């Protein structure tokens, strides 16, 4: 019953590959539904065409700012920001999907995929999904990142949607 969404990733316009995500909708229903709807675009806006603006190898890939493309924008399907739903799930290793924010109850549309266990984020960032297929594609994304997060080529979500 947990939805699966996909991102087709492109590097400077060239296809790289596909990553799919299970959204733990049974445990964070409000958070998961935000991500799911932004991935299908069914509300009239969402992730298609947006970039991954911050990638730090051995740490995480961050994306989801589809309005300013640099970490300062984005919005949720609920409004400009929504609450921290719960912290049932922890940052247990690579492939965890977690919400970016700017302090308590400031979720929007930015998220990050962890490429390392990041336990110091537990109880601060809402975990809501996990890579199901294509962890190898995320590891490939990582090699375009840098220590300060700037990427060496443009990493975009060329297409996205729901698989099940």
Can you tag this structure with a few keywords?
Cyclophilin, eight-stranded antiparallel sheet, acetylation, 8 strands, 2 helices, nucleus, isomerase, 29% strand, 164 residues, Peptidyl-prolyl cis-trans isomerase A, Cyclophilin-type_PPIase_CS, alpha+beta
What report would you give on this structure?
The chain is an alpha+beta fold and 164 residues long. The protein has a single domain (1-164), classed as Cyclophilin-like (Cyclophilin), CATH 2.40.100.10. The chain has helices at residues 29-40, 135-142, and strands spanning 4-11, 14-23, 54-56, 60-63, 96-99, 111-114, 127-133, 155-162. The protein has an 8-stranded antiparallel β-sheet. The longest helix is centred in the first third of the chain and has 12 residues, at 29-40. GO terms for molecular function: cyclosporin A binding; heparan sulfate binding; integrin binding; peptidyl-prolyl cis-trans isomerase activity; RNA binding; unfolded protein binding; virion binding.
């Amino acid at each position: 019953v947990n939805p699966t969404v996909f991102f087709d990733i492109a590097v400077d316009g060239e296809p790289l590959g596909r990553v799919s995500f299970e959204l733990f909708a049974d445990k964070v229903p409000k958070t998961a539904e935000n991500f799911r709807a932004l991935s299908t675009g069914e509300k009239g806006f969402g992730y298609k065409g947006s970039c991954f603006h911050r990638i730090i190898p051995g740490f995480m890939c961050q994306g989801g700012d589809f309005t300013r493309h640099n970490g300062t924008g984005g919005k949720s399907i609920y409004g400009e920001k929504f609450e921290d739903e719960n912290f049932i799930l922890k940052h247990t290793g690579p492939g965890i999907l977690s919400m970016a924010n700017a302090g308590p109850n400031t979720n929007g549309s930015q998220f990050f995929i962890c490429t390392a266990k990041t336990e110091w984020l537990d109880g601060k960032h809402v975990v809501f999904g996990k890579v199901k297929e294509g962890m190898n594609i995320v590891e490939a994304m990582e090699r375009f990142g840098s220590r300060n997060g700037k990427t060496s080529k443009k990493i975009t979500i060329a297409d996205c949607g729901q698989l099940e």
